[PDB]
From a paper:
MSL1, predicted to contain five transmembrane helices and localized to the inner membranes of mitochondria, is involved in the regulation of membrane potential and maintenance of redox homeostasis under abiotic stress.
We expressed an AtMSL1 construct consisting of amino acids 80–497, which lacks the mitochondrial targeting sequence, in the yeast P. pastoris and determined the cryo-EM structure at an overall resolution of ~3.1 Å. Density for the first N-terminal transmembrane helix TM1, which is located at the outer perimeter, is present in the cryo-EM map but rather weak, and thus TM1 is not modeled in the structure. The bowl-shaped transmembrane domain of AtMSL1 suggests that it naturally resides in locally curved, rather than planar, biological membranes. The cryo-EM structure was determined in detergent micelles that are virtually devoid of lipids. The corresponding residues in AtMSL1, V319 and F323, likely play an equivalent role in forming a hydrophobic gate. This indicates that the AtMSL1 structure represents a non-conducting, resting state, which is consistent with the absence of membrane tension in detergent micelles and lipid nanodiscs where the structures were determined. Under low tension, the transmembrane region of AtMSL1 is curved.
Author numbering:
A (entry chain B), B (entry chain A), C (entry chain G), D (entry chain C), E (entry chain F), F (entry chain D), ...: 203 to 229, 236 to 269, 276 to 491
């Protein structure tokens, strides 16, 4: 019915058997082998009793999970009981133990991925690299964290599909956390159709002035830049960039578009025109 | 005929032999080695009897499977019986045990893929990452789940061919579940042949208005966007995008086409024309 | 001459020697070491006798195979006999056993590919992923199965060359079975030179009607689609697709060509013309 | 309450039990097995007492970390206590020890990444390859170091997102330290539309003169170069380059732009014009 | 001088020593350790004698090979003799045996490639995937087999250079045998500049007729095909293909050229012209 | 204070204890276990004393290094002392030894990279593949050697940044030494716009003459070449090349430019003009 | 001074000590442990004496090599002596032996690359795949062999730089030997601007005639070919090829150029002109 009976029955059988053997030998002397064999077999029987009670208790309340647990536990208990009984009796100890050891190492390397996922889930439970809702990028996958488990994490990627990442990928690869950034950084390239480069400095400086006179820029770390990155026949390329304050994602788009339009306005104000890549 | 006879014949032979040896020694004292050897050899004979009964019982009802099982089980039983008998007799114990151990580890690493498939099938039976009929994408393969087994999963890919994925690929790679998405997300890029960028804001805003005034859009998480992503000589690129409600797959196509046509209509309404990439 | 003589010569020599030793000790007491040494050496001699009889029997009927088997078996038997004799005598047991164990693990990892091929051949004999004549695609190779063995499969690829695939590639990679598909799926893209997109809906719908009014289409799972996938200056791209009934391979080509010609006919009927990618 | 009580309670119980057993045997002689069993069980109980005191002491002041530590430590202590008690009693020693050993090697290979990160963090604590604030580039990631830990380093990449690099990547890959450079090096390519190559030497020399007559160049290691790297119909390519003094990052951009404009000025002074790649 | 002397010198020394020790102990009793030590040391001396005789016999007839064999065999014999003598004497048995075991496993993993080549050479000696003269393609290499060895195969590649392929590449990769094909297969693509697609069927059918009315085609497996694979503005692409009888390599070229010219003739007969990709 | 006291305190305690036990047993006989336990515990205490003296001596003169060494050494000493004391007492020997062994192999595989770097640093100390100042190229990195250590080498790459290469990369990859070359080799390709190829020989020969009549060419190994590598409509490509004497890096550039200009001069002298790729 | 003294000092000390102990026990009986300890410690001292003599002898004649050898040998000897002395005394045998074994396997896997290089150098000393001066191509590297060692080979690549290839790359990869070819093979492609393909056969045949009437062609294996590989609007591509006799490298260039010019001459003789790819 419970653990109490599942113990009491084998315990009373074992005490009965050892008390029988004691007065079977007192009034040919292999008390130790038989007593150890009885202890091993009774303990195996008690473990079987407890296992059946528990997964019968679990099915008296997620059901094929209970059947899989029952089958796997019966396999494991049969293996352990066979090894321990062959060692208690003394018949073919090293042979059966070697078989069991090579089976154990087969199973232990075959299960390196499940164990990796579990151990990496725990390691992530210690050094939290992200939290629920953060937009992360792990190797090839990227999206919003929607579930954190012990063997897998669940993301929502750019097409808004739920992705399932095994937790052993967060220990061997770098993790980008797009939700903990305190300032953003934009950079673009504008092509110019220009032959009189004598006004590439002026334009450049003016643009930088515009980027410092713009709200939503961050002048704390790096200054806005706009330099000539390559030249060619009636062609030039300006590389613009700046840092922006911590903003949303529609405001980032609006600021990018606004900076680009103001830059092209400054460029066309000096009589220059855009080039063709 | 059954397990009962397959046991009683060796059990009665063993009891006969040990009862013979007892009164062969009472009225030179190696009772333990001979008795352990008899137990080992009788147990091997009983296992052979039971194996033959079972795969003769299985062939008295998927036939080359039974022959393969018979051959593999005979190989394994010969190995185990040789090891155990050499250990019971005492002749070249460690030599034969070392040979058997290196053979076991050869077989145990050679079989890492079959064991990986089985263990990953069980792990998937616990944490179900998909179900029958779901459209998944696992690494390089993608399609509709049509069969779930213990060592392989079966998909139907985009050309409508049945693919057979070993289950050890669902533990080391990310799984995208296209059938559990609750809203979709579309994004496109429109090129414009424009020289007066002074109307890129207006157009943009108008398009966004259109995407919010459209049924089948999802305004719960992110707002529709339409920003200028790159500019060039008489050329510009608008990046449009939005989220859509949970819809089928022909309605997704229809909505994409409709959004694209309405956007081009708004663009041409402002006197702008499409560009050429 | 046979197994009978190959056994009764060493068996009679061993019985003679142990009967000699018994009355050599009865009328200095190392009966056990000498008897175990005699058993080991006689058993090694009997195994040599049986091996020579068998591969002499095999060469009295595929000949360099027999010579290779003879050489490999003599190597293995020399190794096993040396280990067992050094353990029976008692001279340098652990040294020679360690040498033999490191040689065994060298050979057991050096042979991981042959063992992988054999074990994967058996695993495929259980869960048959294809049969003789099927057109499969395994990773980088594809063709018609023309032979199925235990360590290799033989295909006929697209250039009609016989390919030899090691069977350990069918356990770590996905297998596409092009011969078990129950319906096909075609998809194409048509470019249009169009400036009045006001007739992209009509055309689209008409094409879909054509794909549903065509025999050899499969309306069981997905509906035919034809949507606008990208637009550009006097340019548009229609993505067409449908499912087809289970057909041959020349009928699939004919149906593709027919669908393409009918689609272009519908397109040109509305005054539109094809574009240039 | 503390370690003192957590020790004295089991120590006094053990001393009581061994003093009982001594006069239980003096006035059947298995003093050693029972005494060793009592020592093992008392030590396991004391370790449990100390563990509960410590992680109860830690929760009487970063809380789910304490719960995870408690669970992991209870798992480990149960494993160790089971092994040691089965070895003290003598029941199924080698079986349980083999099970525990294969479980230990499973866990020890499953945890190769966490251990790699920790050991590489220590190795980096010895041979410091960078410090806080340095701009490093490790394999595929690059940015400013913002945090240095034992199992992970934190960077700020080019988009100004915090990246989390596992410390086992700094032992197998090269690390570029962009903050310890003492002089910079610029190099560019200018295309020329030229048919009279008889003035490619002159131009070249003049440009080099310009690069040596420029402040912010470093003439300590290598001389400025400007050579003809490829020629073609009315086309040529000059490869320019030099070293610059240790400067900031906006001054590097300004110097690049200035050198490029001066070079194009020299080129156009000789009647040559820029070409088109 | 020979094996006879190399044995009867150590054998007579050993018999002399054991006969001395027997009457040294009969008229302090460590007969077994000294006798086993004498047997081990005499056997090591005999092995040294035999090794020197053999590689002196081999150098009395490919010479640096003999010197390398001598050095390697002396290294191995020193290792084995040191282990066995330390185990016979009894001084630091487990220490020296552990050193020797870790050295053996170092050497056994360092030599995984040589052993792989040898074992794969034997496996290829059983399942012959090609023979001398066959044109094979193994992974990245392709050419005519000009030599087959035990650790390497020799090919002649397309530039007519001798390539040396390690035999462990024929067990992990697929092998294409270009010399066992029984029929060939050609396929080509012809671009057409056509606006009236109303004659794409006719042309197609005619071409197929031409491919069936041609000798050197194989109508046993698949029928000749010619279908429209893609269309575009005044552009179309016909995909032609067929099987050819088993022919040489200059006849294959001639047949390809002939089929291509006849197809273009049929195409231009219908007033169509070739297009431009 | 020193090693002398750190030894003579535990040595005198141990001698006192064994002299006590001797006359505690002479006037119940477990002299060996208690004496071995005392030796082990005294030796552990002495090692602790010596460790504390040394890293207190090192901190009485590169400080966090000393703290890390102290912590790591205390961890290691606790592990070793626990193992040795549990083995001396006799309580749970095999259990604790198995735990320690699996921990040791965990740490020994987790530290394969640090050990690889150290062993490869030593191997490089024997077979010196470069020296300080040499310009090397190792796999993906290239630059001037600026520091050679035991676990890492330091380079200065093309952008003049200090790179830190782990020394385990110089044992698995090829190393190019750009500072030990004794002659250089240049090769270029010139396109020609030519329709009368009847003067491609002449030009070619003339160019070769020019390359042999030029100082700074090396006529010791290979002769200068200039051949026609591909032809096309009014287009041809000449592939030129030669060896140059051992020269600097600005002279190599000057020689390349000079050879290119002289070749184009010879080409235009024959009425040919350059083509357009 | 030499090996003689380095042996006769420890040998005389050991004989003195055992002769002392014998009459210390004759007129408490632990002769075996003390004698084995004395033998082990004397042997360790003798090995230290011999090591110091040898590397003092080597430094009395490539010097930092001797210091590295001295340090490494002292480390190894300390390890071996500690293990053997702890095993002779009997204090913490299995603990120290386990520590030493895990250290040995750490070092034995950390040194897999050095051992691979050495073993592959020996394997190459047996099956010589090239000799000094041969032009080989191993994987990604190619050049002339300029030095052959035991752990590395030295090449001279195409830029005439000395490359250093680890010898473990010649066992896992294919080796192309450009210096053992007996005939060469050239192949080229000529584009034609042709609309009347009725003269593609004639031209083709004529070209082949030219390739058979040319000296320096090899008509032993394959016949010269020239076939039409692809056609297009006013465009065709002829694929030419042949085998050439064993020639140098400037004669190969001359023959290529000559064949190309003669082919273009034949092509233009038939009124055809070259096309434009
Ligand atoms: C780097 C900042 C935070 C430090 C904590 C990270 C440490 C993680 C490692 C511990 C957890 C691993 C759990 C594995 C269990 C082993 C059994
Ligand atoms: C993450 C959400 C669900 C958690 C369950 C996943 C756990 C899977 C691991 C257990 C099953 C593995 C079976 C292997 C058997 C070992 C023998
Ligand atoms: C998934 C559908 C079918 C299930 C059967 C597949 C199971 C294969 C595994 C068993 C065979 C492996 C043979 C290896 C022998 C081991 C020794
Ligand atoms: C090839 C030319 C030079 C030969 C010397 C190279 C040999 C290197 C190997 C020896 C050094 C390795 C050190 C490792 C220590 C092992 C413990
Ligand atoms: C294939 C043609 C030549 C055959 C000889 C090749 C055999 C090479 C293997 C032997 C040498 C290996 C040396 C390793 C030493 C092992 C210890």
């Amino acid at each position: 019915k419970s653990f109490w009976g599942a113990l009491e029955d084998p315990a009373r059988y074992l005490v009965t058997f050892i008390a029988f053997a004691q007065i079977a030998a007192m009034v040919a002397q292999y008390f130790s082998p038989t007593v150890k064999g009885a202890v091993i077999l009774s303990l195996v029987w008690f473990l079987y009793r407890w296992k059946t009670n528990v997964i019968t208790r679990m099915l008296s309340a997620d059901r094929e999970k209970v059947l899989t647990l029952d089958k796997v536990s019966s396999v494991g208990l049969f293996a352990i009981g066979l090894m321990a009984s062959a060692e208690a009796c003394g018949v073919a100890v090293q042979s059966i133990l070697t078989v069991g050891g090579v089976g154990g190492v087969a199973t232990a390397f075959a299960a390196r991925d499940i164990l990796g996922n579990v151990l990496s889930g725990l390691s992530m439970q210690f050094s939290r690299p992200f939290s629920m809702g953060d937009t992360i990028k792990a190797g090839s996958v990227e999206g919003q964290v929607i579930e954190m488990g012990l063997t897998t994490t669940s993301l929502l990627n750019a097409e808004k599909f739920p992705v399932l990442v095994p937790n052993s990928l967060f220990s061997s690869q770098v993790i980008v956390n797009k939700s903990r950034a305190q300032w953003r950084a934009i950079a673009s390239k504008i092509p110019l159709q220009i032959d009189d480069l004598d006004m590439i400095p002026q334009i450049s400086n003016e643009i930088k002035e515009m980027l410092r006179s713009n709200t939503k820029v961050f002048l704390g770390k790096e200054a806005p830049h706009c330099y000539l990155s390559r030249v060619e026949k009636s062609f030039a390329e300006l590389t613009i960039g700046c840092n922006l304050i911590r903003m949303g994602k529609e405001e980032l788009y609006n600021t990018q578009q606004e900076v680009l339009l103001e830059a092209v306005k400054i460029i066309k104000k000096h009589g220059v025109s855009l080039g063709t890549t």
